[PDB]
From Swiss-Prot, chain A:
This is Portal protein. Coiled coil: none annotated. Belongs to the p22likevirus portal protein family. It is found in: Virion. It comes from Salmonella phage P22 (Bacteriophage P22). The chain holds residues 291 to 339 of 725 of the full protein. The gene is 1. Homododecamer. Interacts with the terminase large subunit; this interaction allows the packaging of viral DNA. Interacts (via C-terminus) with the head-to-tail adapter protein gp4; this interaction participates in the head completion. Interacts with the scaffolding protein; this interaction initiates procapsid assembly, thereby ensuring incorporation of only one portal ring per capsid. Interacts with the capsid protein. Forms the portal vertex of the capsid. This portal plays critical roles in head assembly, genome packaging, neck/tail attachment, and genome ejection. Procapsid assembly may initiate with a nucleation complex composed of portal and scaffolding proteins. The portal protein multimerizes as a single ring-shaped homododecamer arranged around a central channel. Switches upon genome packaging from an asymmetrical conformation in the procapsid (PC-portal) to a symmetrical ring in the mature capsid (MV-portal). This change of conformation may serve as a signal for headful packaging.
UniProtKB/Swiss-Prot annotation, chain B:
This is Head-to-tail adapter protein gp4. Keywords: Degradation of host cell envelope components during virus entry, Degradation of host peptidoglycans during virus entry, Hydrolase, Late protein, Lyase, Viral genome ejection through host cell envelope, Viral penetration into host cytoplasm, Viral short tail ejection system, Virion, Virus entry into host cell. The N-terminus changes its conformation when transitioning from the preassembly state to the postassembly state. The gene is 4. Monomer; homododecamer upon binding to the portal ring. Interacts (via C-terminus) with the portal protein; this interaction participates in the head completion. Interacts with the Tail hub protein gp10. Interacts with the tail needle protein gp26. GO terms for biological process: symbiont entry into host cell via disruption of host cell envelope; symbiont entry into host cell via disruption of host cell wall peptidoglycan; symbiont genome ejection through host cell envelope, short tail mechanism. It is found in: Virion. It comes from the Viruses.
C-alpha cells in the first residue's frame, strides 16, 4: 500500500548514540548507575536484616 | 605394610603398652585379643560418625563373619600408627595401667594428622548470597538477564 511522503514516517530520538564495531550502541543516563544502585539496595537490605 | 589386620593392630597396641610382646616374655591371650578388638571397633565407629567425622577407610565387620579378628582393617599406611597408638591409649585402663607420655603425645599427633586432609577438604567457602548483583562487568550474565546470584 503506497503511503504519502518521500521518507519513512517514523522519527527516532537518541541519547548517547554511536557505533562500536559496526554495532549500534545507544545509552541514556541509567545504564551506568545500575551497579551502584543495586549494591546500595543490597547493603541496605543486609543492614535491615 | 606388615600391619594388615585388626589382630596386627591389637598386637601392636599391646606391644606398645608392654602387656604382651617379645620385648618381654609375655604372649597375647585370646581374651585380651577379643576385648581389644571390640574396643577398637567401638572407637573407630565413634570416630567415623557415619561419614561426618574422621575418614580412614576402616572396614566395619558385619555380624555375618564370626571372627572379627583376622579381617583386614582397610586403613591406609598413614593411619595405622595413629589408630594403634590411640587403641593402646584406650585399652590401657583395662589392665589398670596408664599409657606413657610418649604414647599419649603420639596418639594426639596421629589423630591430628588423620584429620588434617579432611579438614583441608572440608574448608570450603559458601556460594554467593541470593541478593548479590552479578555485576555489569559480566557481559554474558548482563545480556542473559542473570542480574543476581542464585544463592543456597
Amino acid at each position: 500500500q503506497l503511503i504519502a511522503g518521500e521518507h519513512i514516517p517514523i522519527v527516532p530520538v537518541f541519547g548517547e548514540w554511536g557505533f562500536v564495531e559496526d554495532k549500534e550502541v545507544y545509552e541514556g543516563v541509567v545504564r551506568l548507575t545500575k551497579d551502584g544502585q543495586r549494591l546500595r539496595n543490597m547493603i541496605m537490605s543486609f543492614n535491615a536484616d | 605394610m606388615q600391619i594388615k589386620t585388626k589382630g596386627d593392630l591389637v598386637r601392636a597396641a599391646l606391644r606398645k603398652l608392654g602387656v604382651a610382646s617379645d620385648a618381654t616374655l609375655t604372649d597375647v591371650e585370646p581374651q585380651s585379643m577379643q576385648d581389644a578388638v571390640d574396643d577398637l571397633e567401638a572407637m573407630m565407629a565413634e570416630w567415623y560418625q557415619d561419614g561426618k567425622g574422621i575418614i580412614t577407610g576402616y572396614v566395619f565387620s558385619d555380624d555375618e563373619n564370626p571372627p572379627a579378628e583376622g579381617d583386614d582393617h582397610g586403613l591406609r599406611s598413614s593411619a595405622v600408627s595413629a589408630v594403634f597408638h590411640n587403641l593402646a591409649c584406650r585399652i590401657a585402663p583395662d589392665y589398670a595401667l596408664e599409657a606413657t607420655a610418649k604414647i599419649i603425645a603420639t596418639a594426639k599427633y596421629g589423630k591430628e594428622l588423620l584429620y588434617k586432609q579432611t579438614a583441608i577438604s572440608r574448608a570450603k567457602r559458601a556460594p554467593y548470597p541470593s541478593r548479590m548483583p552479578t555485576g555489569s562487568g559480566n557481559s554474558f550474565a548482563n545480556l542473559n538477564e542473570w542480574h543476581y546470584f542464585p544463592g543456597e
